[PDB]
Structure 1
């Protein structure tokens, strides 16, 4: 059936994208170091897709780790547009989520939502290294429940 055909194609594309993200590091503060332990063998992430290819052009998901500043605001943003789609951003830690410990400050924008469309939020100050692995995994399952080719078929 036609819906089966578009379902198999949807699974094939979704399974590929969710399983082989190529995140680009945008660590700015202590939120960078603890994600950078996910690189350490204890919570290896290269076990599933996410690898060292880096090269923000060759990146699917962006992890914004640390406090976001007003002078950092445009340069981070222009990175996001240059990042080709499907682009998703991961909000790392209380500071990148909603400003955290510097919410009432003049050189920080409260949260990354004011700048980029945040798809996933990982609480912590800093979030434990494995907790981000869960956040990546839940983002992986978020891609699994995507119906790009299905929604096109309805149209």
Structure 2
């Protein structure tokens, strides 16, 4: 019982430390990259939340796929995806990314990004408003809040 209490408080602590900052890498092919830059704006700060734009892949917390994936882009996309630390989460920003969008019935366009990586947050819009993307990142933080990792390790 008291071991359960310790595991619960420790799991909540480390999940809180994970959901604290979460700096991504800005992948950003098309105009949704411009809107990522506009949610790096003074009027909508990533830096109030610990979110930092940083193209270093080896310290990427989450990854924002935003833009139009193509057949020539996809192998390099997953090759970037695999050189990432093991706690990883994916935010698909944009109508192109979360299901193909306007270029859906076309060659040289991967139908969304379910066909390459696992996706965790879908934020739609063309472009999704910085407002909407930031609501998506807050909902990502609350997904990280509900994870019970070390509790499942304890009752394993």
Which range, TM-score by smaller chain?
over 0.9
Distance in 2, Cα, partners of 1:89 & 1:139: 9
Question: Is the 1:60–1:87 Cα contact (8 Å) retained in structure 2?
Answer: yes
Which whole-Å deviations, capped at 9, do the CAs of 1:38-82 have from their partners, x for residues lacking one? 111111011011114441111110001100001000000011111
Tell whether the 8 Å contact from 1:95 to 1:111 is kept in structure 2 after alignment.
Answer: yes
Could you tell me which runs of 5 or more consecutive residues in structure 2 were left unpaired when the two chains were aligned.
none
Q: Separation in 1 of the partners of 2:19 and 2:10?
A: 14
Displacement of 1:84: 1.0
Aligned residues: 155
Cα pair 1:29 1:65 within 8 Å, conserved: yes
CA RMSD of aligned residues (A): 0.8
Who is 1:106 aligned against? 107
- Contact between 1:22 and 1:52, CA under 8 Å: does it hold in 2? yes
2:119 maps to 1:89: no
1:5-56 superposed Cα distances (whole Å, 9 cap, x missing partner) = 0111111101111111010011000111112111111110110111144411
TM-score (norm 1): 0.97
Moved over 3 A (4+): none
Is the contact made by 2:63 and 2:89 (CA closer than 8 Å) also made in structure 1?
yes
Q: Distance in 2 between matches of 1:143 and 1:54?
A: 22
For the 8 Å contact 2:35–2:130, the answer to whether it is kept is: yes
The structure that is helix-richer by fraction is 1
Q: Using structure 2 for the length normalisation, give the TM-score.
A: 0.97
Seen in structure 2, the aligned counterparts of structure 1 residues 87 and 100 have a Cα distance that, compared at 3 Å, is same
CA contact 1:22–1:54 (8 Å) conserved in 2: no
- Cα shift readout 1:87-126 (whole Å, capped 9, x = no counterpart): 1111011100000000001011111010000011001110
